[PDB]
Amino acid sequence: LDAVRKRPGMYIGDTDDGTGLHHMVFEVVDNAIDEALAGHCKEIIVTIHADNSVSVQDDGRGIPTGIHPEEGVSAAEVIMTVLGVGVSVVNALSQKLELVIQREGKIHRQIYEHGVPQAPLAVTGETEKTGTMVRFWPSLETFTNVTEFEYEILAKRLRELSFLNSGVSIRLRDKRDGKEDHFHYEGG
Amino acid sequence: LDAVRKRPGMYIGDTDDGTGLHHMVFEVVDNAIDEALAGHCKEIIVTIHADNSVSVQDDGRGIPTGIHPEEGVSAAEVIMTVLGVGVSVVNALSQKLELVIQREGKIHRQIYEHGVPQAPLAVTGETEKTGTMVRFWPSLETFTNVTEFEYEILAKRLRELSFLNSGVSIRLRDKRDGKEDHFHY
Numbered sequence: 001l002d003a004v005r006k007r008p009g010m011y012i013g014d015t016d017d018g019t020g021l022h023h024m025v026f027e028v029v030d031n032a033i034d035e036a037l038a039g040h041c042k043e044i045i046v047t048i049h050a051d052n053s054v055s056v057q058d059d060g061r062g063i064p065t066g067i068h069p070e071e072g073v074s075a076a077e078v079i080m081t082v083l084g085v086g087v088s089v090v091n092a093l094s095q096k097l098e099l100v101i102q103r104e105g106k107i108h109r110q111i112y113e114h115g116v117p118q119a120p121l122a123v124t125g126e127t128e129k130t131g132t133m134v135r136f137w138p139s140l141e142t143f144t145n146v147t148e149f150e151y152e153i154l155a156k157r158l159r160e161l162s163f164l165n166s167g168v169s170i171r172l173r174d175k176r177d178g179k180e181d182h183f184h185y186e187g188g
Numbered sequence: 189l190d191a192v193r194k195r196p197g198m199y200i201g202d203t204d205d206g207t208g209l210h211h212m213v214f215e216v217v218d219n220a221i222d223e224a225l226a227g228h229c230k231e232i233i234v235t236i237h238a239d240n241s242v243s244v245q246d247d248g249r250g251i252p253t254g255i256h257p258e259e260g261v262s263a264a265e266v267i268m269t270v271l272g273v274g275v276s277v278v279n280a281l282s283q284k285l286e287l288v289i290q291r292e293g294k295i296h297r298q299i300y301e302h303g304v305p306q307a308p309l310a311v312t313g314e315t316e317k318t319g320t321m322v323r324f325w326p327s328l329e330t331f332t333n334v335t336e337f338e339y340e341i342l343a344k345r346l347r348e349l350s351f352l353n354s355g356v357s358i359r360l361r362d363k364r365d366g367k368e369d370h371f372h373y
């Protein structure tokens with residue numbers, strides 16, 4: 001990840017005008033849509049939290065959690081820490097990132113700070129559901145000037161995406177003011 | 189450097205009891221002694237600053253500044269960013285690190301934050317002197333509980349080093365309370 005940290009602008013885009021900041025959300029959304037398309041129901045939920053973090057949930061199979069034979073860590077960690085631009089870029093440029101994977105009846109949890117995992121991926125409990133959740137706090141050392149998420153920028157893009165991804169329910173929620181939207185095109 | 193950031197205790201030592209914190213200084217000192225040993229004047233200066241940073245100076249040749257052909261960056265940056273344990277570990281676990289190299293008639297400067305160079309090593313002026321200086325601010329995300337440098341822990345180790353490295357003068361200065369020592373065999 002040190003390559004991304006050296007020159008963040010080359011990977012995410014402009015880090016001052018807010019375009020790079022919103023590209024962080026859309027990179028994560030692309031991965032979530034990818035996961036949601038594997039299942040039958042297919043719903044993603046994008047939430048803008050009151051602390052200007054964004055979470056993206058899907059109800060898909062869940063990112064692989066088993067140990068990678070070469071890397072010697074969970075396959076989830078490899079995805080988050082090895083170099084669309086990749087979710088590893090989002091992780092690198094997030095001062096905090098929370099990963100929650102529900103898979104094979106188990107809840108898996110891991111926390112990152114500036115791309116560095118705080119502990120190995122851990123099974124913390126049980127679940128009937130499946131899916132992946134990523135919540136990230138954009139790094140204020142990287143992202144300057146425009147640091148807060150504009151609802152309209154996300155709402156517009158997710159609406160455009162709904163028509164290209166048939167059968168995928170996309171929910172947008174803003175916990176700052178309670179505003180929400182539901183984009184679900186069922187064509188074909 | 190992510191391997192170091194992932195498990196800092198495994199490289200630097202215990203990050204809670206103060207062992208790792210002080211080992212940061214000693215790793216930098218090891219490189220300063222190597223550089224001092226191959227200079228005419230053989231002195232290093234370890235300074236504890238008021239803002240809880242430490243700087244280590246030598247008056248040796250200055251570490252190499254030319255572009256490393258494989259890595260494509262200054263040889264100094266390769267030393268600071270690629271894996272005694274090494275100054276790259278110290279760089280990775282410092283919230284800020286200032287590098288100053290005096291070599292071949294030129295002053296070179298570079299700043300790192302958490303091991304990440306803020307710009308390429310740059311020529312900032314002219315000089316007659318030679319040597320290397322590294323000042324580092326230990327990351328308060330990594331180093332907990334014991335966050336401040338104890339003078340006597342550093343003085344004890346530098347005394348031991350002065351006997352082993354007989355030719356090398358070692359000065360220790362505390363800018364918080366004006367305390368100082370000069371170890372030389």
Ligand SMILES: Nc1nc2ccccc2[nH]1
Pocket residue numbers: 005113114116141193301302304329
């Ligand atoms: N605050 C902060 N910024 C960082 C950048 C890279 C690795 C660790 C870091 N901690």
Ligand SMILES: Oc1ccc(Cl)cc1
Pocket residue numbers: 028029031032033035056057058063087132133134
């Ligand atoms: O919902 C998701 C799924 C995958 C990833 Cl990397 C992030 C969010």
Ligand SMILES: Oc1ccc(Cl)cc1
Pocket residue numbers: 216219220221223244245246251267275320321322
């Ligand atoms: O004085 C010195 C010399 C070399 C290094 Cl890497 C750091 C400090």
